[PDB]
């Protein structure tokens, strides 16, 4: 089939490349549609549905069957967008026109806006396949010990202000994945607060948390329970800590 043109210079290779262009167009359509199972329909800064919703249509709902009796999640669904919707946000318009920032009205860390934002996830812990809780304190994880690396437990916690706020007490560990997720801190004020390991750097003599200063460690969201942490609490905590890279920069030193 060399030099065998159906018409003109059109042989099996041209047929193939044009067929691929078609398949690729269809595939881009499929992928961009499947990327629309979250975040849609589009909104205004006022919260209303926008006149423009896109050039690819939002696809048909699929259903996720959840283990552990947790139910069925439909994507896209108005129920999923309503459950993950923040209400009564503490933000003020910077301008009447669109495309301009929204300014926090109070303490954006406490009010959970901007990089300190959190999503209203379900107030239920993340579970493993057996139905147990995925994140546990290492005391409740039977068999777990520090196989390698530095043990942070007992180390003082230095903040962005270069001041010390307390000492590490316990390690919250992902049991199926065998890794540290949060380290708990005994604050000098008599309170226990969680902090993500990804935002804590273990030195030989200290644990440095440069995100937030000493003022913010006290207002960190607490867990209703001391043995378990919910997805919601996790999101609140991690947002609060991360927001300090912006809202605690004037205090940060060195």
């Amino acid at each position: 089939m060399v030099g065998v043109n159906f018409f003109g210079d059109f042989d099996l290779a041209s047929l193939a490349i044009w067929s691929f262009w078609g398949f690729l167009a269809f595939l881009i359509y499929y992928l961009q549609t499947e990327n629309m199972r979250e975040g849609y329909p589009l909104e205004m800064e006022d919260g209303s549905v926008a006149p423009n919703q896109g050039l690819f249509p939002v696809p048909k709902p699929k259903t996720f069957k959840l283990p552990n009796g947790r139910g069925e999640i439909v994507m896209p669904s108005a129920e999923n967008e309503a459950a993950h919707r923040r209400n009564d946000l503490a933000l003020a318009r910077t301008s009447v026109s669109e495309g301009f920032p929204h300014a926090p009205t109070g303490n954006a860390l406490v009010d959970g806006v901007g990089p300190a934002s959190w999503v209203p996830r379900r107030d239920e812990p993340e579970l493993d396949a057996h139905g147990h809780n995925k994140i546990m304190p290492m005391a409740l994880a039977k068999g777990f010990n520090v196989t390698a690396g530095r043990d942070p437990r007992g180390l003082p916690v230095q903040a962005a202000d270069l001041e010390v706020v307390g000492r590490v007490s316990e390690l919250w560990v992902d049991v199926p994945e065998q890794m540290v997720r949060y380290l708990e801190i005994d604050l000098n004020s008599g309170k226990k607060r969680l902090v993500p390991m990804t935002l804590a750097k273990i030195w030989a003599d200290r644990v440095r948390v440069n995100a937030i200063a000493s003022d913010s460690f006290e207002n960190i969201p607490a867990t209703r329970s001391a043995s378990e942490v919910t997805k919601l609490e996790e999101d609140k905590i991690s947002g609060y800590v991360a927001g300090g890279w912006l809202y605690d920069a004037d205090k940060r030193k060195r």
């Binding site: 800064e45 959840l66 993950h84 920032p101 901007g114 493993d128 199926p176 991360a242």
Partner: protein, 281 residues
């Protein structure tokens, strides 16, 4: 324009240069100092390419080629019809890439996420630079840089390579190829696993990371993990680009002969040199 959840994240801050100035959005795009700068540079470079192919008389986008200056011109700025346009386009491309990366920095520090993405982009920027700035400088001319054409920079690839016999025999080239192949393999496998867990067989509940770890352990006896696979692929791509930049920076600056003759030091090792038999004996 806004996603259902985008409002609470649209706050002020996260700017390296300018404050209130240039802190706004054009639709979805965030435009700051570096958004402005990269738009300017990108539009100027595009228009320069279009004018260059107009001068040449070529409007088929598959034959457009803006070639560099000659090797005789050296490092000097050439007539715009003889390579100055390539030079301006290269300046604009560098500026646009760097401004894109710094815009990503601004966006990251506005969102509160880590700066891994501009770091990873910097590797590709640096490889492009190795190709059009640094290796030409060490070689003494911009004529060794690749042209801005869809199918002509492939001619540059081929000829640059065959100037050293088969370029397959460069060892850093080998490492780059291996890392690229492994990156593609790992991406395919990661997508496959996440989708197999999230979209399982009809009539079955959604799976967890336990099922993924178990699948890959039953398959090959090891699972690197959810965080490990991401660290791994990131580093794989970065090492691929690093070893490509190495293969090219040494190619006509420290090496000048065919790359196949490099390996003959292990053949000429004085204890098995003259043994008879095999390919080299």
């Amino acid at each position: 324009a806004l996603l259902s959840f985008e409002r609470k994240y649209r706050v002020p801050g996260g700017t390296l240069v300018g404050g209130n100035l240039f802190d706004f959005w054009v639709g979805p795009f965030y435009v700051g100092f570096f958004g402005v700068t990269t738009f300017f540079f990108a539009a100027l470079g595009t228009l320069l390419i279009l004018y260059g192919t107009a001068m040449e008389g070529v409007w088929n986008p598959q034959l457009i080629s803006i070639e560099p200056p000659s090797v005789e011109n050296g490092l000097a700025f050439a007539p715009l019809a003889e390579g100055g346009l390539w030079q301006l386009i290269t300046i604009c491309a560098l500026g646009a890439f760097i401004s894109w990366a710094l815009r990503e920095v601004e966006i990251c520090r506005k969102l509160g996420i880590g700066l891994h993405i501009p770091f990873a982009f910097s590797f590709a920027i640096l490889a492009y630079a190795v190709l059009v700035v640094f290796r030409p400088l060490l070689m003494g001319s911009w004529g060794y840089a690749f042209p801005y054409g869809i199918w002509t920079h492939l001619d540059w690839v081929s000829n640059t390579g065959y100037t050293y016999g088969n370029f397959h025999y460069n060892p850093a080239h080998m490492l780059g190829i291996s890392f690229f192949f492994t990156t593609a393999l790992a991406l395919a496998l990661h997508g496959a696993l996440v989708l197999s867990a999230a979209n399982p067989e009809k009539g079955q509940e959604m799976k967890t990371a336990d099922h993924e770890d178990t699948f890959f352990r039953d398959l090959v006896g090891y699972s690197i993990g959810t965080l490990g696979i991401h660290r791994l692929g990131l580093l794989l791509a970065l090492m691929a680009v690093f070893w490509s930049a190495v293969c090219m920076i040494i190619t006509g600056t420290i090496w000048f002969d065919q790359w196949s003759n490099w390996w003959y030091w292990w053949v000429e090792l004085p204890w098995w040199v003259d043994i008879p038999g095999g390919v080299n004996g």
